[PDB]
Amino acid sequence: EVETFAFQAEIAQLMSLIINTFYSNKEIFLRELISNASDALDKIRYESLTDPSKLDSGKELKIDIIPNPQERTLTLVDTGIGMTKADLINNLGTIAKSGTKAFMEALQAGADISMIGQFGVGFYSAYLVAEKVVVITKHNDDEQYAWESSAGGSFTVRADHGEPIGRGTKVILHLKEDQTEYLEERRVKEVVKKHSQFIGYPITLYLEKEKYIDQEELNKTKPIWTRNPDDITQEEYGEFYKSLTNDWEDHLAVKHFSVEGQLEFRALLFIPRRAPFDLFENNIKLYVRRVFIMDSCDELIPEYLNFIRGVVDSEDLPLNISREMLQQSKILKVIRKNIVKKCLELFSELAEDKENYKKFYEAFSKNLKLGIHEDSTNRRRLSELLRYHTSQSGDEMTSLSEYVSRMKETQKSIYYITGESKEQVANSAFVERVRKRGFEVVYMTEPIDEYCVQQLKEFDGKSLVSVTKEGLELPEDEEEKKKMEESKAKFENLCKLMKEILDKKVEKVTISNRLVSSPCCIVTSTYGWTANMERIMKAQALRDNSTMGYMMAKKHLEINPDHPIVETLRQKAEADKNDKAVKDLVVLLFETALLSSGFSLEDPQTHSNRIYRMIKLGLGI
């Protein structure tokens, strides 16, 4: 009844699939060949550990690239283990059969090798470019053989009897007409640097330049992340960073770590000394067994840490058939979690070095505050890295932890004020009273600060209070409260008169507890956008205008009872309930308060015209 069968494969169609569909970019053939060559070396090197006599054929392990435009041939020579005739038929001649994996599983216990080859289809990627491939191999055991093929479903193995190759393999690709750009020095150098830059063995490119053969070592920067982090000095770290980033300045700080368990990977991160000019408009590169896999973009690192330049190297990771992406995206999330944790730890330990942390903060404070805006899980740890200019700080910047340390015994919040400049904020009207009482105020004078404090609601159990927002309530004395209530009862009449005069401009006009020298100030409502925040949002190039009015706040006017102007205005308003002079005066006062508070003016020409008219009245016109 039941008739069992066995799976088969269409060799011609399978070869066509490998040639045409597996690999998107045709330049990766080098990446494969060198990889195979690397493995060819690794094997023999391993066999040299317990038997040095196996290296008598050749004492040197190297890789050579020889472009010959005369015959349009790209040659890749390696002094590796080489392949026997049986190895030629079984390994090269069989698709999906890798000799490297078979060698790897035949190792005793846990050895020190880790070879790239896993799938068995890497070699045929050479036919992405070549129209014919000739592999001249010479193993230590049997004689030198030649393997010729053109991906036509058949290949020929022949005794070579050519010039001896010592030990190893020489792969000659007869490039097709279209893909002749790989004979150029520039293309070969670029490809090798992009893909197989960190191969352990020296890769030498031969060329012809009177007329002599010139040799150039394509890879010279040894991958230092493999070495133990404790052994590496700072000079080696700087050299590696400079070679990696083409930067004359060395690194500012370096975090070299390793994660072991079900997911083993070691990473090396660098903080640049300065910030890139272009910046926001390649940061982290993922390596598997020391060969390039993919370039990180929002996967390994968040957007706000895109200034970190580094490498991630893993011995075992699921890989695409094309060896340029991973199979499981969850692994990328795990890598990101570990990298972010180690980066925050690096920043925290860097905060001890005062001058270095000053440089780092001056460079990447915008990134830190962007992370506070975005990374909700790391807000509590990122906030401790914030440095701000305060009233008690002076020229230097102090952290919020220092603020809490110096915070008065009865103070219950951290008072902050935002503006477009440090001078405007320092001389601003809102902080006039608080500084009189001795409470430290935090100046935040960058556009990213508004985004930072949209999310950073509190810190160290102390809430942030905006001085320029309504409902500010400093601790009060009983006498101060009595005076405030009496002044409110006295000035309610002028307040309602001003409210009547300033219709649809100010929702509420009240006396203020935050003014000591300025006559009046315009203060944003509780939930709406602050003046500075409204200025920032109004200037965004790509943002909906029709929605702005939903988030725009309602202005509140606050008058100072002790300022002479307000008292005189109150007396005039009581004496004359309606008058042209008082109306003009209150309109001008509101205009000045609007200008000083931070708000833009709906028609500044009107205010300027009023000033010009009063100037004319001053000098006579």
Ligand X SMILES: Nc1ncnc2c1ncn2[C@@H]1O[C@H](COP(=O)(O)OP(=O)(O)NP(=O)(O)O)[C@@H](O)[C@H]1O
Q: Which residues are annotated as a binding site for ATP?
A: 36, 78, 97, 123, 323
By CB under 8 A, the residues from 366 to 405 that bind a copy of itself are 366, 370
**Residue 372 site contact among ligand X, a copy of itself, Mg ion, none (CB < 5 to 8 Å, cut-off depends on kind):** none
Single-letter amino acid code for the residue at 89: I
Q: From residue 465 to residue 504, what is the string marking binding to a copy of itself with x (rule CB under 8 A)?
A: ----------------------------------------
Long-range contacts of 87-95 (CB under 8 A, 24+ apart): 87/137, 87/139, 88/135, 88/137, 88/145, 88/147, 88/157, 89/157, 92/123, 92/135, 92/147, 92/155, 93/147, 93/155, 94/120, 95/9, 95/11, 95/14, 95/15, 95/18, 95/120, 95/121, 95/124
Q: Does 248 bind a copy of itself (CB under 8 A)?
A: no
CB of 116 to a copy of itself, least distance (A): 14
Chain centre to alpha carbon of residue 416: 29
Give the containing element (helix H, strand E) for 239.
Answer: helix 234-245
Report how far residue 62's alpha carbon sits from residue 78's, in angstroms, rounded to the nearest whole number. Answer: 6
Q: Does 262 bind a copy of itself (CB under 8 A)?
A: no
State in Å, rounded, how far the first CA of the chain is from the last one.
118
Token pair recorded at residue 601:
């003016």
Q: Which residue is nearest to Mg ion (CB)?
A: 122
Q: From residue 123 to residue 162, what is the string marking binding to ligand X with x (rule CB under 6 A)?
A: x---------------------------------------
Q: From residue 107 to residue 126, what is the string marking binding to ligand X with x (rule CB under 6 A)?
A: ---------xxxxxxxx---
**Residue 496 site contact among Mg ion, ligand X, a copy of itself, none (CB < 5 to 8 Å, cut-off depends on kind):** none
Per DSSP, which regions of 201-308 are E strands? 203-208, 213-217, 251-259, 265-272, 284-288, 292-295
Contact (CB, 8 A) for 284 and 339: yes
Contact (CB, 8 A) for 519 and 563: yes
Closer residue to a copy of itself (CB): 55 or 325: 325
Q: Does 86 bind a copy of itself (CB under 8 A)?
A: no
Spatial neighbors of 491 by CB under 8 A, at least 6 apart, are: 511, 559, 561, 566, 570
Q: From residue 569 to residue 588, what is the string marking binding to a copy of itself with x (rule CB under 8 A)?
A: ----------------x--x
Q: Please choose, out of 74-82, 188-196, 205-213, 591-599, the segment that lies near a copy of itself by the rule CB under 8 A.
A: 591-599
Give the residue among 479, 457, 596 at the shortest CA–CA distance from 531.
596
**Residue 7 site contact among Mg ion, a copy of itself, ligand X, none (CB < 5 to 8 Å, cut-off depends on kind):** a copy of itself
Closer residue to Mg ion (CB): 103 or 237: 103
CB of 85 to ligand X, least distance (A): 13
Report how far residue 584's alpha carbon sits from residue 214's, in angstroms, rounded to the nearest whole number. Answer: 87
Closer residue to ligand X (CB): 28 or 531: 28
Q: Please choose, out of 11-19, 176-184, 204-212, 409-417, the segment that lies near a copy of itself by the rule CB under 8 A.
A: 11-19
Q: Does 378 bind ligand X (CB under 6 A)?
A: no
Report the binding-site residues.
36, 78, 97, 123, 323
Spatial neighbors of 140 by CB under 8 A, at least 6 apart, are: 54, 57, 81, 82, 167
Three-class SS of residue 10?
A: coil
Spatial neighbors of 229 by CB under 8 A, at least 6 apart, are: 256, 257, 258
By CB under 8 A, the residues from 132 to 161 that bind a copy of itself are 153-159
**Residue 15 site contact among ligand X, Mg ion, a copy of itself, none (CB < 5 to 8 Å, cut-off depends on kind):** a copy of itself
By CB under 6 A, the residues from 73 to 102 that bind ligand X are 78, 80-83, 91-92, 98-101
Report how far residue 329's alpha carbon sits from residue 392's, in angstroms, rounded to the nearest whole number. Answer: 49
CB of 595 to a copy of itself, least distance (A): 5
Kindly state the DSSP code that residue 469 receives in the 8-state scheme: B
Q: How far is CA 174 from CA 141, 149, 244, in A?
A: 28, 11, 33
* Beta-carbon count within 10 A of 303 CB: 13
CB of 178 to Mg ion, least distance (A): 24
Closer residue to a copy of itself (CB): 428 or 510: 428
Q: Which of 312, 429, 465, 501 binds a copy of itself (CB under 8 A)?
A: 429
CB of 437 to a copy of itself, least distance (A): 19
Q: Does 595 bind a copy of itself (CB under 8 A)?
A: yes
Report how far residue 586's alpha carbon sits from residue 568's, in angstroms, rounded to the nearest whole number. Answer: 12
Closer residue to ligand X (CB): 54 or 101: 101
Query: For the chain, how big is the Rg over CA atoms in Å?
Result: 37
CB of 17 to a copy of itself, least distance (A): 6
Q: Does 619 bind a copy of itself (CB under 8 A)?
A: yes
> Which residues make beta-bridge pairs with 73?
68, 174
**Residue 40 site contact among a copy of itself, ligand X, Mg ion, none (CB < 5 to 8 Å, cut-off depends on kind):** ligand X
Q: From residue 520 to residue 539, what is the string marking binding to a copy of itself with x (rule CB under 8 A)?
A: ---------------xx-xx
H helices of 316-406, in order, are 330-350, 354-374, 379-382, 400-406
Count of residues in the chain:
621
CB of 40 to ligand X, least distance (A): 3
Q: From residue 10 to residue 49, what is the string marking binding to ligand X with x (rule CB under 6 A)?
A: ----------------------x--xxx-xx---------
CB of 300 to a copy of itself, least distance (A): 17
Closer residue to a copy of itself (CB): 79 or 98: 98
Backbone angles phi, psi at 165, to 5 degrees: -110, 10
Instruction: Please tell me the count of residues contacting a copy of itself according to CB under 8 A.
Output: 103
Contact (CB, 8 A) for 43 and 81: yes
The residues binding ligand X (CB under 6 A) are 32, 35-37, 39-40, 78, 80-83, 91-92, 98-101, 116-123, 169
